[PDB]
Amino acid sequence: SPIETVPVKLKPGMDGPKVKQWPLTEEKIKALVEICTEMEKEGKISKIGPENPYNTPVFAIKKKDSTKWRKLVDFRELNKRTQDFWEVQLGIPHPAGLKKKKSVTVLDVGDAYFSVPLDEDFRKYTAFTIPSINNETPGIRYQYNVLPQGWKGSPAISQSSMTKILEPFKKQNPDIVIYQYMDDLYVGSDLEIGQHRTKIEELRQHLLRWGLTTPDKKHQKEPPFLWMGYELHPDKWTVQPIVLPEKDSWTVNDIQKLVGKLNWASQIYPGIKVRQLSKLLRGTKALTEVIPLTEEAELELAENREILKEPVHGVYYDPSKDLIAEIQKQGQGQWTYQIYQEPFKNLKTGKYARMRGAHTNDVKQLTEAVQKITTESIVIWGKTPKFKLPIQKETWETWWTEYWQATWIPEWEFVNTPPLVKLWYQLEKEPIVGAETFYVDGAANRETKLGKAGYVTNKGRQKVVPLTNTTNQKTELQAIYLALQDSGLEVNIVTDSQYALGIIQAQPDKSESELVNQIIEQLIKKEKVYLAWVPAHKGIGGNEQVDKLVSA
Amino acid sequence: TVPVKLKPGMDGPKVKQWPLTEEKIKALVEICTEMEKEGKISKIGPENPYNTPVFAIKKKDSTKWRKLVDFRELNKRTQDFWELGIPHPAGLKKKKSVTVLDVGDAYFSVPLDEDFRKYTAFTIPSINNETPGIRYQYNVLPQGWKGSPAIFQSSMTKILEPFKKQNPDIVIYQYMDDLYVGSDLEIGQHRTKIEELRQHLLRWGPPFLWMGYELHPDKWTVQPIVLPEKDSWTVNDIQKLVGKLNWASQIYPGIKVRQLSKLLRGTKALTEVIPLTEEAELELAENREILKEPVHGVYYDPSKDLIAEIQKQGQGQWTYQIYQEPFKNLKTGKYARMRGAHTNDVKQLTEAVQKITTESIVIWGKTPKFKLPIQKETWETWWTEYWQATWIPEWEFVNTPPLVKLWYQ
Ligand SMILES: CC(C)c1ccc(O)c(=O)c(O)c1
Ligand SMILES: [Mn+2]
Ligand SMILES: [Mn+2]
């Protein structure tokens, strides 16, 4: 009652959810009128006259096999029809983001959403009906008076009201740190044990004076502080091995609770790949939908399950010291990094996988790692860490100065921990004097996919090769490959393929395409390689010669 | 007070707030606490689903953090203003000196349509999500918004009238939070007029706009397309020449490469010196001529986006080209440098983007959409760290290495 209700609107142009009630058993109804009668007493819900026009389906089921019946409301049509709210930063606070405070206390505010009032004008859209047993009497109609569970607005509206409540206790104690994440309220401070407990007593009364029952404890174990899944100790935090459900038939409402878990664990644990299990699951709603995973999902859940099997430990943040990030090269598009302030006292350890694409090279991947780490750090600590990277300063210089793109890494120092990242081949800027000049070209016939790939040189040397099931783009890379094969250590190579030039001017050092790779290797074996380009069919010699040889 | 709305049938801006350093978050909290006290902004609840990013920057020179809201999305969703909107002075570019002044501060004096306030929501992020977002919405003309200078138009005219009548020959263009003052006076008096114009505003009604961003449009140079001039060419030189002239034949139909290619008859070593024939020499001459007159037909069209491509040329050099239709360049330049071995490619590019957007405002009265030679993830990460303008242009990211880099010198 003391709290100011938030104003809520159904989406524009939409009307309230009129739904039909599913008939129930005398045993499910009797209970309900029970669960309800109590609820109506706390003022959580009211009985509506005969006259409201909206309705929501009411269901009732078990809570343990130690059988009892709890209440379930199907807020599906209403969640579609209710104004969008601002989930704010559906971000997840990292334990290593917490600083060392002396005294800590975790208050589990959960029961409080029932305790927040619902906009008086919107309560009429939450009307539900308790069916009558032989339908000899009119059902019983309740509407909600508090943030109803299962609805769109209870999450954000309450988490918001909370803030307003705390924002005055927070302003009064500039030294005490308070963080709220769902159920959980973390209270930190540097106070003695016994001044802390005192303030906690004021916070508790202050919350009560705003009309919400704080729960204090009913089973009281220790200082291992439990705050939204983390084990908080005086000078270190721990995340216990996560136990993922083991089952026969996966459901869409247990697979959804999985990705959420995986996500949460995603920023605590390294290499937690969840992209396959999300593409089976989104936007498809179920009365009757039940899913087999795909054998690329029982194997992933295999890998995740193996990683979540080991505990995670880390230290807290000491703002007085530098933040350090160290990365090593792991393989198959994999990289490992550790962020710390004091050597061997890690704040966060993680893993980066390469971003999907046909061609790539180690340098672009490292850079991508740095920017991922950089952004993660800024979110958790508000600053950018210094980088210890496995790449010579000379290598990086050669790279960014020559690369056709703009690129940058933050302050960083070289760390010699093999395998070191490097440049395997380097195209020349000018022609090579004394080298053979290989004008190359290719062609293919879309109808038959039959084509040829050849080359001619200033030394008379020449070669064309018939090919099957190939393409024009394929044949020009094939022609280059041939040129690299039959040439000495140094070589000039004129082409007319803008496509082939694109791939090589990107300087890749692995492609998931066999051909490119073959060229890549061939390049790695060369001492000097000058790759030119000319316009097709304009009469430049030896572009024309070879065109004539491969065209027909 | 003025009634504003979104374009018909579209909902407002819901963009996500990117992470901010601790330093920046602190400055934004200060600035917003003040603004809330002065009644400019007001905390909002969760029933407001919109959001616009927000970060902080230091200007050309100040001690001071300036709150910059990225209204790009709300701008293109805000009904263009005609029932008003501003005219661009083609004379501005022709002036000897143009100084830019931040009058944005003045926009805060006009109330914003009650019903339009919600669409201006923004959130100050908290480090490590300790606290959930502090959320506000404007109750006034927000800087960085386009509907702002549009509504403060009548008010801005009335304030400049005395300066206009007495000082009739300066040109004054208002773009977003910016006022472009151009004149053919000498820097001494030019800057006296400015300070005079300054005093005018302080007297006629964050806080600093003391500074002058002075440019010199009359001295901005376009880079033409040129061809080498050598006493001995190689197969390679000729091959390059022909590839480029063939490219320049897409802009100038009069180009001929016949007599040049004819020099490459057979299959020679790239490093072989090939003497120039009379036929070739002439064709080269004739082409050289054509490449120096302007493109046949390129007048600027106001109802179309401007497009800018940039090409990292190495050694801190950069070339760019603005156009609306391909091969119909309105302008082409070469942004030589900061002066040296500028070790932050990303910084150089960010400086280049701003300079180009400046030149664009002066010349056409609007910002161009950019095609940036960078990995989206590298730009999104670091760009706000070198930004000094009060406006933000639209950009995309070029992933494919262009061949035109080899031709725009
Ligand atoms: C003139 C067109 C059909 C063309 C395009 C691209 C090539 O790589 C060629 O080799 C070619 O011979 C012709
Ligand atoms: Mn070809
Ligand atoms: Mn060909």
Side-chain angles (χ1 to χ4, degrees):
Chain A
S1 295
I3 309 176
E4 186 184 6
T5 76
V6 187
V8 174
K9 298 172 171 180
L10 284 173
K11 299 204 181 187
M14 295 192 209
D15 180 18
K18 284 131 218 222
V19 150
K20 280 195 176 184
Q21 177 62 59
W22 304 113
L24 298 174
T25 59
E26 283 199 358
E27 65 163 298
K28 282 182 179 182
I29 289 181
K30 275 180 53 182
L32 280 180
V33 53
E34 303 210 338
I35 309 145
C36 284
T37 300
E38 308 174 5
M39 276 190 64
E40 211 215 348
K41 284 300 186 181
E42 279 65 62
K44 308 293 185 181
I45 64 183
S46 306
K47 293 186 209 198
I48 24 167
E51 72 257 330
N52 182 310
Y54 305 127
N55 193 79
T56 290
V58 73
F59 293 164
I61 198 40
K62 69 349 157 157
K63 233 33 261 100
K64 322 238 139 63
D65 239 66
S66 17
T67 207
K68 262 209 211 192
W69 311 84
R70 204 157 278 57
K71 139 120 117 65
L72 180 74
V73 190
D74 192 25
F75 291 124
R76 243 202 300 271
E77 306 313 336
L78 181 38
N79 284 341
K80 288 185 175 77
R81 293 163 191 297
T82 308
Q83 87 167 70
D84 285 329
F85 304 72
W86 195 242
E87 350 181 41
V88 42
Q89 251 245 353
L90 242 64
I92 305 161
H94 190 297
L98 297 170
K99 291 185 290 182
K100 284 183 181 182
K101 287 314 236 175
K102 192 189 299 174
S103 300
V104 176
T105 299
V106 187
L107 306 163
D108 238 89
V109 184
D111 178 354
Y113 73 94
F114 234 28
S115 309
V116 170
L118 179 67
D119 187 1
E120 189 71 58
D121 299 317
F122 193 75
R123 309 177 169 187
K124 61 113 123 85
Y125 297 126
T126 62
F128 63 73
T129 323
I130 298 180
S132 188
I133 216 333
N134 46 218
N135 357 328
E136 70 175 2
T137 58
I140 296 182
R141 301 257 280 146
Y142 288 92
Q143 88 181 8
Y144 263 85
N145 278 272
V146 317
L147 298 191
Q149 203 206 180
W151 180 58
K152 217 170 144 213
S154 336
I157 282 183
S158 73
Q159 176 180 292
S160 171
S161 308
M162 191 62 80
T163 299
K164 286 203 168 185
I165 297 314
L166 301 149
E167 176 119 67
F169 192 108
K170 253 174 209 188
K171 193 176 166 59
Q172 262 61 310
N173 306 282
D175 288 314
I176 296 186
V177 328
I178 287 174
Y179 315 164
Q180 52 162 329
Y181 194 66
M182 305 184 61
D183 72 29
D184 273 338
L185 185 28
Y186 168 98
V187 192
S189 75
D190 280 325
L191 279 196
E192 33 173 52
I193 200 55
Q195 277 186 61
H196 181 71
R197 290 172 176 146
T198 301
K199 240 88 220 284
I200 298 296
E201 174 199 339
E202 316 189 359
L203 170 57
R204 272 171 167 164
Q205 311 175 58
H206 169 99
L207 292 172
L208 189 58
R209 297 166 192 156
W210 265 100
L212 281 46
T213 169
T214 185
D216 302 322
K217 24 215 264 151
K218 163 217 169 177
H219 192 341
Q220 49 294 147
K221 268 275 169 126
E222 29 191 40
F225 299 110
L226 298 177
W227 174 55
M228 47 155 312
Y230 309 131
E231 295 205 317
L232 303 174
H233 292 299
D235 47 24
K236 70 92 167 176
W237 56 271
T238 293
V239 177
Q240 294 300 302
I242 304 307
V243 175
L244 276 43
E246 243 160 345
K247 57 181 63 180
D248 192 13
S249 283
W250 283 91
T251 157
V252 180
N253 178 208
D254 262 337
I255 281 187
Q256 78 166 191
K257 302 190 172 187
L258 175 56
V259 171
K261 273 211 175 292
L262 251 34
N263 285 325
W264 177 84
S266 291
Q267 37 137 20
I268 308 295
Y269 291 95
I272 293 273
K273 287 185 303 180
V274 346
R275 196 250 176 173
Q276 296 305 322
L277 296 183
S278 230
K279 80 196 274 95
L280 345 176
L281 172 84
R282 297 288 182 182
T284 60
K285 30 184 210 158
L287 219 354
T288 287
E289 262 316 67
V290 134
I291 302 168
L293 300 209
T294 25
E295 219 291 83
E296 274 276 336
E298 210 84 50
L299 185 58
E300 187 183 69
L301 182 34
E303 182 66 11
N304 284 337
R305 186 192 301 295
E306 207 66 14
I307 303 174
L308 296 182
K309 200 46 191 180
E310 193 97 2
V312 183
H313 303 295
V315 300
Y316 296 110
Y317 185 46
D318 166 28
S320 72
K321 295 162 167 292
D322 273 320
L323 213 54
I324 304 298
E326 195 164 20
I327 309 161
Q328 326 87 14
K329 184 199 140 40
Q330 198 53 8
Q332 191 76 45
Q334 234 90 66
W335 307 75
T336 47
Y337 69 81
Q338 311 80 44
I339 304 164
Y340 60 83
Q341 295 187 282
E342 265 158 313
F344 305 111
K345 297 302 211 95
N346 298 326
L347 282 161
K348 188 187 187 299
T349 61
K351 217 159 167 252
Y352 177 67
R354 191 250 309 190
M355 104 189 239
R356 297 290 185 273
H359 326 300
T360 181
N361 88 4
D362 287 334
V363 175
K364 290 196 228 285
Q365 275 179 55
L366 183 52
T367 296
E368 295 179 351
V370 171
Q371 319 288 348
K372 178 243 184 99
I373 285 168
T374 277
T375 299
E376 288 184 305
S377 290
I378 286 178
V379 175
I380 297 164
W381 306 302
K383 56 172 294 180
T384 328
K386 296 196 176 206
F387 288 99
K388 302 310 173 202
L389 307 172
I391 173 174
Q392 300 272 193
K393 280 271 178 173
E394 256 205 319
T395 292
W396 172 255
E397 196 184 303
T398 302
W399 169 257
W400 77 275
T401 49
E402 297 305 326
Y403 193 43
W404 74 279
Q405 264 191 7
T407 202
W408 193 68
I409 283 333
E411 190 177 324
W412 68 279
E413 303 189 311
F414 166 57
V415 65
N416 191 314
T417 116
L420 301 191
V421 168
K422 184 157 291 183
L423 298 181
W424 296 100
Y425 60 98
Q426 198 114 233
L427 305 186
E428 298 271 315
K429 312 258 242 178
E430 293 299 307
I432 308 170
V433 171
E436 206 177 336
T437 309
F438 282 47
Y439 301 76
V440 318
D441 194 2
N445 174 282
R446 341 203 182 255
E447 301 94 306
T448 68
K449 275 61 181 189
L450 293 175
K452 316 169 192 173
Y455 74 67
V456 310
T457 94
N458 60 301
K459 286 218 288 229
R461 176 201 317 272
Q462 289 197 31
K463 158 183 233 156
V464 187
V465 180
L467 307 142
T468 55
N469 201 58
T470 190
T471 87
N472 277 279
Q473 290 196 168
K474 208 140 261 203
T475 47
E476 315 242 4
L477 291 168
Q478 244 150 189
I480 284 177
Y481 182 26
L482 294 169
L484 286 169
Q485 229 182 218
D486 306 326
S487 39
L489 280 176
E490 311 185 329
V491 62
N492 288 304
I493 289 181
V494 191
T495 160
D496 72 23
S497 183
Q498 327 203 44
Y499 166 75
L501 207 57
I503 310 304
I504 302 177
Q505 285 187 326
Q507 283 238 219
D509 77 8
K510 284 130 201 179
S511 192
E512 267 58 62
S513 139
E514 170 163 54
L515 192 26
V516 179
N517 283 291
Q518 281 182 289
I519 308 182
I520 293 179
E521 238 289 80
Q522 279 296 149
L523 284 164
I524 305 177
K525 283 186 171 65
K526 300 289 177 184
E527 299 305 348
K528 296 202 171 204
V529 177
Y530 178 50
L531 172 63
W533 177 104
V534 294
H537 285 298
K538 297 286 173 172
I540 294 169
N543 163 255
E544 275 306 332
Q545 318 297 319
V546 70
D547 170 73
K548 206 70 178 183
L549 284 195
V550 301
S551 273
Chain B
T1 46
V2 16
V4 188
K5 243 287 98 146
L6 307 169
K7 292 174 180 178
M10 64 182 1
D11 196 357
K14 313 191 175 184
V15 180
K16 283 175 181 178
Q17 172 61 55
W18 56 76
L20 297 172
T21 49
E22 198 168 62
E23 178 180 40
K24 299 193 208 135
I25 295 189
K26 281 179 184 181
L28 286 179
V29 167
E30 294 182 58
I31 302 176
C32 291
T33 296
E34 271 300 319
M35 292 196 303
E36 188 191 5
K37 288 177 179 175
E38 299 180 57
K40 301 171 185 173
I41 65 185
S42 297
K43 291 234 205 172
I44 53 202
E47 72 282 18
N48 175 312
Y50 314 98
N51 194 78
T52 280
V54 65
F55 62 119
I57 64 165
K58 292 180 173 191
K59 265 156 81 182
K60 284 302 170 184
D61 165 313
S62 319
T63 334
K64 144 157 120 205
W65 291 96
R66 187 184 181 307
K67 179 174 91 142
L68 173 40
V69 176
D70 176 53
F71 278 106
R72 278 187 277 163
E73 199 78 50
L74 174 61
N75 281 338
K76 61 197 236 279
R77 287 169 180 269
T78 287
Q79 85 190 339
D80 296 323
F81 281 68
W82 319 299
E83 335 88 297
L84 354 206
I86 313 174
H88 179 262
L92 186 53
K93 51 168 165 291
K94 245 107 191 168
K95 295 303 183 180
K96 312 295 282 292
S97 279
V98 179
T99 301
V100 192
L101 274 55
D102 185 51
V103 311
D105 190 60
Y107 294 163
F108 293 153
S109 61
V110 185
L112 181 64
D113 179 42
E114 295 78 6
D115 308 309
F116 190 81
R117 292 179 187 175
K118 57 186 182 184
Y119 303 128
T120 50
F122 67 100
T123 93
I124 304 178
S126 80
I127 301 300
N128 184 22
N129 292 339
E130 141 197 79
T131 138
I134 323 188
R135 257 168 134 264
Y136 302 106
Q137 77 177 19
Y138 278 77
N139 304 310
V140 329
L141 289 205
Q143 286 155 329
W145 182 47
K146 121 194 155 184
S148 294
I151 296 163
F152 196 68
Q153 208 176 359
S154 50
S155 315
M156 184 58 100
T157 303
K158 184 168 179 58
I159 296 177
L160 297 177
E161 180 158 54
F163 178 87
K164 291 209 144 196
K165 293 187 58 183
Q166 249 219 142
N167 313 264
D169 270 63
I170 273 90
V171 174
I172 298 175
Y173 180 43
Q174 173 176 62
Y175 192 67
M176 302 276 153
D177 294 0
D178 280 347
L179 203 79
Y180 293 77
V181 190
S183 71
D184 296 299
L185 289 166
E186 307 179 299
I187 202 179
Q189 28 186 27
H190 163 91
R191 302 178 59 171
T192 303
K193 297 289 184 176
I194 301 298
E195 134 67 0
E196 272 205 51
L197 182 62
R198 264 186 194 103
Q199 284 311 313
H200 248 77
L201 274 63
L202 297 180
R203 172 157 49 68
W204 257 93
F208 302 126
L209 91 118
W210 29 289
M211 340 164 253
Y213 189 32
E214 194 169 299
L215 320 158
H216 297 292
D218 202 314
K219 273 193 174 181
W220 284 340
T221 23
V222 298
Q223 168 63 70
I225 294 270
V226 289
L227 311 184
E229 310 203 318
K230 315 152 99 72
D231 306 332
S232 88
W233 303 65
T234 61
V235 183
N236 197 196
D237 292 319
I238 310 291
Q239 258 165 57
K240 273 156 69 185
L241 183 51
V242 149
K244 140 176 252 167
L245 283 172
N246 186 71
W247 165 71
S249 72
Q250 293 188 105
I251 301 163
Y252 304 72
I255 301 297
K256 298 288 186 183
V257 293
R258 186 170 67 207
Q259 319 290 177
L260 282 159
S261 302
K262 173 175 293 187
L263 291 162
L264 303 171
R265 287 183 169 177
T267 333
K268 306 193 180 60
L270 285 186
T271 79
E272 169 169 344
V273 174
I274 301 168
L276 287 191
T277 65
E278 295 284 53
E279 296 181 297
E281 223 336 88
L282 201 168
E283 185 181 63
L284 183 52
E286 174 176 46
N287 286 312
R288 203 184 286 287
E289 285 290 59
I290 308 179
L291 285 171
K292 222 159 250 265
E293 36 197 70
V295 209
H296 68 291
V298 189
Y299 311 116
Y300 161 55
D301 183 353
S303 67
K304 292 191 302 178
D305 295 343
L306 276 166
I307 294 177
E309 293 182 317
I310 325 223
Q311 286 91 211
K312 171 181 157 197
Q313 294 289 343
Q315 301 197 312
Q317 273 201 329
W318 302 63
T319 49
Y320 64 102
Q321 308 98 220
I322 308 198
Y323 64 69
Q324 299 187 287
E325 293 299 307
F327 313 113
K328 300 207 180 174
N329 291 333
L330 284 146
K331 176 180 180 42
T332 77
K334 176 183 224 202
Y335 256 123
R337 64 188 197 151
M338 232 303 229
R339 319 215 265 135
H342 205 306
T343 61
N344 185 322
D345 255 6
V346 185
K347 181 168 183 169
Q348 294 185 61
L349 178 70
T350 312
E351 269 184 49
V353 169
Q354 298 181 93
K355 288 196 143 177
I356 294 177
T357 307
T358 281
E359 293 180 24
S360 174
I361 293 176
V362 168
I363 306 174
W364 303 286
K366 74 177 185 185
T367 58
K369 154 113 176 173
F370 290 74
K371 287 189 163 203
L372 308 160
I374 193 156
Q375 258 283 128
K376 163 186 148 152
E377 298 88 20
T378 319
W379 176 262
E380 304 205 322
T381 287
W382 290 117
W383 79 262
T384 65
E385 271 277 304
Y386 315 103
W387 208 245
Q388 289 192 291
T390 59
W391 38 239
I392 315 176
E394 318 284 332
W395 43 54
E396 29 187 80
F397 304 98
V398 170
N399 304 129
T400 311
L403 244 180
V404 352
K405 106 102 94 288
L406 188 71
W407 304 310
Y408 269 139
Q409 302 318 271

